[PDB]
Structure formats: structure tokens, C-alpha cells
């Protein structure tokens, strides 16, 4: 009989809920009632990116704030020059089904993955004029959905097998395996200190993990639908989460509870990108209504609307220095937005 | 523009030129999706033409075909079924001998209904391949068909039994006006299956050929 273990599991869950309620005394909306509102924010597409022949599924910003890498279903990885719009590289891909792409912090490697269950690492600083695949990370039985670079040698990967893995480039083996997710994990984001990273799965939950020991500390709940996007706050003690349900939720690594939700009645679509700004005041959320609304992180107010896409927006990232914001949609176009 | 800046611009134009050439080749290739349920004769159909998903390429009458075997993903279907939007047709494989083995046919019907009423495939033609007909004739002579369908009223023959199964799969679509479903029976020694796929995609090519003409 295993019902005795279930009974004590429910008691532990009740204790967790009771602890969250005790620590909750004031809503983030109430404490920020004396802050001057931002007002209205207008962003214009300074540069549009042309050259993709299929829907764009992922895009990542380099650490130099100039180089952009975009992944599409056409099977081509393109390294874009944001300032000058020219294409630095065009890496052919063995598998045309790509769901995620990563840029190394040092800029010498580019990662890609998709339905082939393989995280291909491409060497972008070859002596030759071409870019080869340095490693083909294999071992995942589920579709790759998000991969991020800890450093030039360590790369984390979230796949459709409901398990996240830490990969070693030199040996091509899983150093640590993250288990505990019932549903397949879609999106992940690394903390600024690289020691932590959150994972969002279809089980309507987000989990905090440790790189060193490969164990889960906190499980975040509150979403009524599956999680599609999740990003870390600039500070590192918080993180926002996106879901198919038209709502954005902000959690803390210390309070271990939701503070304020970002939702509207006029919106009923899904969320694909939740990337934060540099200062963390602005929350940019990509949606399925061809729109990328601007959310005030401290007030859940509508400060601006980013429109101009003819299809669903699938990727959205903020550059390292926060100067400009790039948005990629299924219309095979990437738009870089800036203020005036 | 500087000396090296102009050189970078020229490289981008050459990169764009190569990208356009590859896209023209891709636009001339027919994409097909294989969505069989529970290994319902996936091997026999694939071998008749000419690790995660399997990419199968074959050419028939100067037309290149791309077939994807995505049934081995074993994950959330709705999280990657949108990547197959715009596909020319969907090839469905259902074994006729699985009705005698929470029935296996009901599992195929549930997955068929999921993709026939899917938003991403609201106009994609479906090619239903009812394979393993050789064993169906032998099985129908020793096992009644009423096990799978309690509402069946016909006899234990084969021609009427096959029509009833085909009819059941043809009433699972709520968009019959805008989407057509093709049904075929394939045996072990059959060799005309590739022609039927070619015939099915010709109609799809017809629909999208006059779409650029401003007719639909």
C-alpha cells in the first residue's frame, strides 16, 4: 500500500501553502501605489531583418549587443549584425526542425536543437571559412525546447523528455540530470550568477535547480495552463513566467510565491516570450495576437504596445545593455525596437 | 562605408543569394507527414516507396517527396504539431488487424480526430492508408467485427466490413467541405501505393497553384 505516503505528502503540501500565506502580508500592487506611473512608451522598428524563408522559432542576443542569432524552420542558422543588418554567417543545419537556439557568452559557439533530440554545437571561430558542428549532444528522448550556455564548455538543455540535463562539450556526456517534472519542460533561463536556473514545463509549474548538485529546491505554482516562456529577473532573486493562458506571473526565489499577475480581458491568447528589460521595470511579453504588449512589472499596467508583425510572435529578447529590443515572429521577420 | 564594411555587405548579399537558391529548391519539394497510431504498419508503407523523427526522401515521376516519421517523438503532440503547418498532405496508417487486439482502433480514431479537427490542419488533405488487409480477410473469418463496434449491424463479410471501417474514419471530420480525406487499402505485395500518394498531392498542388492566381 502506498496511500500512507500520499497522506503525508498532502500534509507537507498544506504546510507549504500555509507558509506562503503567512509570509504574504502586502500585495506588490499596494506597496507600489505611490510610485509615479511610467505613462506611455512608443517603440519603432529601427531595423527589420530579411532573409528567413520560414517561421522563426527562436532568437538569442550576443554579449556584444551587436550580434544576433536567429533560428527558423528552413534549416538555416543566421548570425545577424543588428547595427548594420548584414548577415555574418549562414550555418546550414542537418535537421530543419529547430525549436531553440543559443549564443555562447564568449561568442565562439552557437547551439541549436529541435525535434531531432540533438543539441548541435557550432564552432564560429574556425580557422577555415566555414562553420562546422563541434559536438552533437545526444541522450534526450524528448524534443529540445530550450538550451542555454553556462560557459564555453558547460551547456544546459531542456527537452521534451520532462528532464533537464547539463552537458559537457569536451566529453559529450550528461554531467548532471534534472528530474522531477511531470510534463515536458519548454523554457529555461539562467540566473545572472549562473548558479541557478528555472525551468517551465507543461505541468503548469516552474522549478528552481542547482547547477552544482542537480537538485530542485522550490516548485512554483499558480498558473492555470501550461508554461511556454519563463525568464529570470535582472536582480536574480525573481523571475517571470508565461503561459498559454493569457496571464503573466512573477515569482521570487526567496518569498516562493506570486506577487502580481499581468493579464487583461481584451487578451485571450498565448504567451511565447517573457524576456525582461535591463532594469527589470519593463516586462515585454510576446503573444499570439501578432502583438508584444509592454507590462509594468511594479503595477501590471499597459505602458505600450509593440505591433507590426503579420503572424504569431515566437521569440523576443532584450540585448545585454538594454539599448534595443528585438522581436521575431512566424512571418520570417525580425524587428529591432527602440525608443525616441 | 569603409573598405572592410563594404566587403561585409558583399558577403551578406552572397549569403542572401545562396539562401534564395535553397528556398527555391525547398519550394519544389513536396512535404508529407506520417502520423500512424501505435506502429500501424509504418514499416511496410515506408519500404514500399521508391534517434527521433525519421526523414524519408523519394522521387516519383520527377517530383521530390519529403516524408517525416514523427510518431517516435513520444511527447506532447500539440507542442510540435504546429511545426508541420503548411504541409502538403498528412499520411495516416491504420492497421486493419488491430480491431481484435481501450481498443487499438479506438486509439487510432482518437488520434485521427485530434488532427482532423486541429486548427493547424484545417485545410490539409489527409491520406488514410488502411494497410494489413491480407490478415483482415483471414481474421474476419474467425473473429466477428462486432467486438470493436457494438453498433455494427452487418454480416461477417469483408467488403462491407472494410466499408464500415472506412466510413467510420470518414465521419470524424467536421470540415468536410474545406478538407478532403483519401482512403486506400494496401497489402504486403501492393505496389501502387506511391501512385495514390502522387494522385492525392496533385490535387493539393492544383489548389495552391491557382491560389497565387487570385482565384480562391
Amino acid at each position, epitope marked *: 500500500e502506498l496511500d500512507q505516503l500520499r497522506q503525508e505528502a498532502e500534509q507537507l503540501k498544506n504546510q507549504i501553502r500555509d507558509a506562503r500565506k503567512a509570509c504574504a502580508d502586502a500585495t506588490l500592487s499596494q506597496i507600489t501605489n505611490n510610485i509615479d506611473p511610467v505613462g506611455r512608451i512608443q517603440m519603432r522598428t529601427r531595423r527589420t531583418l530579411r532573409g528567413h524563408l520560414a517561421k522563426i522559432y527562436a532568437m538569442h542576443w550576443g554579449t556584444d549587443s551587436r550580434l544576433l542569432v536567429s533560428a527558423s524552420q528552413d534549416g538555416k542558422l543566421i548570425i545577424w549584425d543588428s547595427y548594420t543588418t548584414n548577415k555574418v554567417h549562414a550555418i546550414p543545419l542537418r535537421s530543419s526542425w529547430v525549436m531553440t537556439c543559443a549564443y555562447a557568452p564568449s561568442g565562439n559557439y552557437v547551439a541549436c536543437g529541435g525535434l531531432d533530440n540533438i543539441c548541435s554545437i557550432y564552432n564560429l571561430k574556425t*580557422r577555415e*571559412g566555414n562553420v562546422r558542428v563541434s559536438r552533437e549532444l545526444a541522450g534526450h528522448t524528448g524534443y529540445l525546447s530550450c538550451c542555454r550556455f553556462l560557459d564555453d564548455n558547460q551547456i544546459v538543455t531542456s527537452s521534451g523528455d520532462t528532464t533537464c540535463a547539463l552537458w559537457d562539450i569536451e566529453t559529450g556526456q550528461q554531467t548532471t540530470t534534472f528530474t522531477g517534472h511531470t510534463g515536458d519542460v519548454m523554457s529555461l533561463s539562467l540566473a545572472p550568477d549562473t548558479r541557478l536556473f528555472v525551468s517551465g514545463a507543461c505541468d503548469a509549474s516552474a522549478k528552481l535547480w542547482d547547477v552544482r548538485e542537480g537538485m530542485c529546491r522550490q516548485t512554483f505554482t499558480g498558473h492555470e495552463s501550461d508554461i511556454n516562456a519563463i525568464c529570470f529577473f535582472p536582480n536574480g532573486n525573481a523571475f517571470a513566467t508565461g503561459s498559454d493562458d493569457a496571464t503573466c506571473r512573477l515569482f521570487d526565489l526567496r518569498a516562493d510565491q506570486e506577487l502580481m499577475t499581468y493579464s487583461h480581458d481584451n487578451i485571450i491568447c498565448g504567451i511565447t516570450s517573457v524576456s525582461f528589460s535591463k532594469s527589470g521595470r519593463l516586462l515585454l511579453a510576446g503573444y499570439d495576437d501578432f502583438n508584444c504588449n509592454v507590462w509594468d512589472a511594479l503595477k501590471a499596467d499597459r505602458a505600450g504596445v509593440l505591433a507590426g508583425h503579420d503572424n504569431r510572435v515566437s521569440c523576443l529578447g532584450v540585448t545585454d545593455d538594454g539599448m534595443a529590443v528585438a522581436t521575431g515572429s512566424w512571418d520570417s521577420f525580425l524587428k529591432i525596437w527602440n525608443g525616441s | 562605408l*569603409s*573598405a572592410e564594411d563594404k566587403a561585409a555587405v558583399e558577403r551578406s548579399k552572397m549569403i542572401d543569394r545562396n539562401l534564395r537558391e535553397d528556398g527555391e529548391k525547398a519550394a519544389r519539394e513536396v512535404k508529407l507527414l506520417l502520423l500512424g497510431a501505435g506502429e500501424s504498419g509504418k514499416s511496410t508503407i515506408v519500404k514500399q516507396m521508391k534517434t527521433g523523427i525519421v526523414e524519408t526522401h523519394f522521387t516519383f515521376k520527377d517530383l521530390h517527396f519529403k516524408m517525416f516519421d514523427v510518431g517516435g517523438q513520444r511527447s506532447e503532440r500539440k507542442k510540435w504539431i504546429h511545426c508541420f503547418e503548411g504541409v502538403t498532405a498528412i499520411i495516416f496508417c491504420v492497421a486493419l488487424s488491430d480491431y481484435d487486439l481501450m481498443n487499438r482502433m479506438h486509439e487510432s480514431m482518437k488520434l485521427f480526430d485530434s488532427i482532423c479537427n486541429n486548427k493547424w490542419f484545417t485545410d490539409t488533405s489527409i491520406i488514410l492508408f488502411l494497410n494489413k488487409k491480407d490478415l483482415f480477410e483471414e481474421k474476419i473469418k474467425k473473429s466477428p467485427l462486432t467486438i470493436c463496434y457494438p453498433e455494427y449491424a452487418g454480416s461477417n463479410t469483408y467488403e462491407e466490413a472494410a466499408a464500415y471501417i472506412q466510413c467510420q474514419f470518414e465521419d470524424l471530420n467536421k470540415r468536410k467541405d474545406t478538407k478532403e480525406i483519401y482512403t486506400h487499402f494496401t497489402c504486403a505485395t501492393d505496389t501502387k501505393n506511391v501512385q495514390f500518394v502522387f494522385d492525392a498531392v496533385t490535387d493539393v498542388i492544383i489548389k495552391n497553384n491557382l491560389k497565387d492566381c487570385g482565384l480562391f
Partner: single-chain antibody
Amino acid sequence: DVQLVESGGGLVQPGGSRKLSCSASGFAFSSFGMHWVRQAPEKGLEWVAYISSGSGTIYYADTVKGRFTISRDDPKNTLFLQMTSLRSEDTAMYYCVRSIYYYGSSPFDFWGQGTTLTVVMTQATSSVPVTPGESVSISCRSSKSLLHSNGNTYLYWFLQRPGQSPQLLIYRMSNLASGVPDRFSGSGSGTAFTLTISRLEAEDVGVYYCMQHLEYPLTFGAGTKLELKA
């Protein structure tokens, strides 16, 4: 590894014609822009011709314009340079240099061995006495402001050890080339440039050649030899 072997040298009578075949092996010749640089005996370097990756864009030196014709064969990975009406000043060692848009610049990273042919941007004193273990600084000057509107200064530093092909050290006067020690460094302000070396070694003896990649018309420097003290 990366190799660039040239052939087609020897004794050429004045007014004749000859062709140089710089064979390419170990790298993608199709995506690499190629340059021709000649070095007169006991003299410096001077740019001759350049061909882009797609052969669409080709420039030429003023002294060799029209008389010299260049071509490339991407499938055969071989670079050609046919010459017409060779003069007395055309005798030099011709090097084929592969250039690619890399790190926001076009490094002259690899230089060929060269072949024997027989028929603005000033530098400091050609001879400077140096000793191992000491720091030596080499200065440079330009007739025009090499700084561009994009904030990039186009300066290239080259090392030509005796009995060896020139090797790139610093490109864009701020980024070290691949395979070079961290001792070398560069600085400047768009008109005056200096190169600083932390610690000298027995392999640092040679002639330092400066180069500008601003306009085309890349004018090399006279040279700076660092001989060992007695």
C-alpha cells in the same frame, strides 16, 4: 592545416608574360578573399591586387593597373595572377593572402610562402637596437585619419622573421591575432600609432610592417628591424 603554396616563378625576360598559381588547401577557398602582395629585394611590402570571394569585386594597384590581370578557380582552389609587359620594377616575392570578414574586420591572418620573380603611412627608423628581456616600442604615423565614423581604426601589424613568410600580429590596432602571445599590444588615435611589446624573445627578431585597410590603396610601411645587440 592551412597551407598556401605558390608556383610559377623563375627568370622572366623583360616585356614577357608569366602567371602565378597560389594553390589553396586546408580552408574554404570559395568564401575567402585573396590578396596579392609583393616584396622587392631588401625592401618593404606593397599591395598588388585583390579578388573577392565571389570574384564580383576586384581592385588593382596603380602601378599594376591594366598590365596585371587576376582570376580565381573556386572548384580547383587555385588563385591565378597573369602579368603582361613585365617591367624592371616588377621583380619581387609575391605572397597570396587570404582575407575574410572576421571579428568585424578582414584579417590578413595567413600569408603564402611566395615565389621568386626576376626580370603616406611612414614608419620610424628601419634599424633599432634591442636586447632580449627588454621592452621595445615601435611608432607609426598616417597621412590621413584612419579612424572611421563607426569607431573602428584600421591598422594591421605584421611580423616577417628572417627566412619566413610575414605573419599577422595585430588587426584593427586593438585585437590580437590568433596564435600570438599576449606580449604584443597596439594603441593609437587615428593619426599616430604605437606598438608595445612586454618582453622580447629570440623569435621576435624581424621587420615590423604596418598596414592600413581604410582605402584600398593599402599603403604599407617602410619597416622596423629589431636586431640583437652585441
